[PDB]
Each structure stands twice: as C-alpha cells, then as structure tokens.
C-alpha cells in the first residue's frame, strides 16, 4: 500500500546540497512554505469565483503553524486548493533547478531559491524528514514523504482528514529546534511574511 519513487536527478542534487550546506540563513524556509500555501489559497479562492461548491470542503482560507516539542515537529497547514496524487508526484518529484543550480555559480545556496520555483526544498535546511499531506477536491488524501537520499514515498493517508488543502510536516534536525520556539517563529514571520494575504496563526503549546 506504499509506492516508492525516485527524485529527478537534478532535484536529488539540489537536495543533497541543501541537506549538507552550512548556510546560515536557514529561516527562509518558513517564507518559502508560507509562500507556497499562499499560492495554493489564491488558487482555490479564484476557482471558487465561478464555482462556489469548490469551498464545500472548507470555507476558511488560512495558514496555521504548529510547533510540537514532544515530537520535534513544526507543521504548516493550509486550506488552499491542495494536490491530487498526480500533482503530488509531479510537483515534489520533478523539476528549473538547473537555473538555480547553475545560479550559485561555484558556490553553496542562496535566499533566491524562492524566485526559482524550488523554494520548497529549503525545508531540508532545517529538517531531516519532510511529510506532505494533501487533499484536493478531486482526489483522496495522500501522504508524501522523504528523508532525502534520492527517493520519496506516496501512500493513501490513514490519519485525520483535512477536508481540503496541504499540510507540511517537518521532522526537525537535532540542533534546529529553535523553530519550535514561539519567539523565533513570530519574529521570522514578521520579517519575511507579514504581507501575505491570509491569516497566519501560530498555535501556542499548552503546559
């Protein structure tokens, strides 16, 4: 009930570079993922203009951020358009990077991943493992997942349903746990993402 796929070569290269780099400016991953969530929300919102049954799976258009120190995960949840099994494998599996890859001339990364369509992968600046959970109106709920190393998996999600949208779960590296800190997140969002056109809500952890 689980399929394994290979990353297109250019993507695996890019990932290996990100995973390893000592790049300082790691917080930019948060801007890339919020930026992707914002695009997905634009998509569903604009589709709903001509066909409001679109929103039947959820009217709220927002972005949630969820630190979990017991699990050492940070989750970004949106209720944008979401991805069918096929968008999921295309979008996360293939490329584009060449641009970027050849962009860091003879060097190691830059805050320009975003302007290059591959900003998602910057998640690997801070995470040893990413899981992507996604619900498009047309399809079932799927879980994508990869610890890098050239392959990802795709299966049908068994967990709580989402109605619609995308959920990006980062399993944080041992020494990047500052992004589970309420203070650091607020600061990061304010710096890189406050002019995003949807509510971004930080969930504070309970005692």
Q: Distance between alpha carbon 100 and the CA centroid of its chain, in Å?
A: 19
**Block residue for tokens 């309420």:** 182
- 78 touches ligand YI5 by CB under 6 A: yes
Provide, rounded to whole angstroms, the least separation between the CB of residue 59 and ligand YI5. Answer: 17
- 157 touches ligand YI5 by CB under 6 A: no
| Size of interface with ligand YI5, in residues (CB under 6 A) | 14
* Interatomic CA distance for residues 122 and 23, integer angstroms: 11
Contact 100, 81 (CB under 8 A): no
Provide, rounded to whole angstroms, the least separation between the CB of residue 144 and ligand YI5. Answer: 9
**Block residue for tokens 């619900």:** 135
Exposed / middle / buried, residue 141 (Cβ in 10 Å: 0-12, 13-18, 19+): buried
For residue 78, which phi and psi values (nearest 5 degrees)? Answer: -130, 170
Handedness of CA 22, 37, 98, 146 (dihedral sign): positive
Q: Which two tokens stand for residue 64?
A: 């949630």
Q: Which of 27, 36, 77, 118 binds ligand YI5 (CB under 6 A)?
A: 36
- 166 touches ligand YI5 by CB under 6 A: yes
Task: Tell me whether residue 33 or residue 180 sits nearer to ligand YI5 (CB atom).
Answer: 33
Q: Which of 91, 111, 137, 147 binds ligand YI5 (CB under 6 A)?
A: 91
- 28 touches ligand YI5 by CB under 6 A: no
- 141 touches ligand YI5 by CB under 6 A: no
Task: Tell me whether residue 116 or residue 207 sits nearer to ligand YI5 (CB atom).
Answer: 116
Nearest C-alpha neighbor of 162 from the set 79, 81, 105? 79
Query: Has 51 been labeled as part of a binding site?
Result: no
Q: Which of 133, 148, 162, 168 binds ligand YI5 (CB under 6 A)?
A: 168
* Residue showing the smallest CB distance to ligand YI5 in the complex: 40
Residues forming the site for ligand YI5 (CB under 6 A): 33, 36-37, 39-40, 78, 80-83, 91, 120, 166, 168
């Amino acid at each position: 009930e689980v399929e394994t796929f290979a990353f297109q070569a250019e993507i695996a290269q890019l990932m290996s570079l990100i995973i390893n780099t000592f790049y300082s400016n790691k917080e930019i991953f948060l801007r890339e993922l919020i930026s992707n969530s914002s695009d997905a929300l634009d998509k569903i919102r604009y589709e709903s203009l001509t066909d409001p049954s679109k929103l039947d799976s959820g009217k709220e258009l927002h972005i949630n951020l969820i630190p979990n120190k017991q699990d050492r995960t940070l989750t970004i949840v949106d209720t944008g358009i979401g991805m069918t099994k096929a968008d999921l494998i295309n979008n996360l599996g293939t490329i584009g990077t060449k641009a970027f890859m050849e962009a860091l001339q003879a060097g190691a990364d830059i805050s320009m991943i975003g302007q290059f369509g591959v900003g998602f992968y910057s998640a690997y600046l801070v995470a040893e493992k990413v899981t992507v959970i996604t619900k498009h109106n047309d399809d079932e709920q799927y879980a994508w997942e990869s610890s890098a190393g050239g392959s990802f998996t795709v299966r049908t999600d068994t967990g709580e349903p989402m109605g619609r949208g995308t959920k990006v779960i980062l399993h944080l590296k041992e020494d990047q746990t500052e992004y589970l800190e309420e203070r650091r997140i607020k600061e990061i969002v304010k710096k890189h993402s406050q002019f995003i056109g949807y509510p971004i809500t930080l969930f504070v952890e309970k005692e």
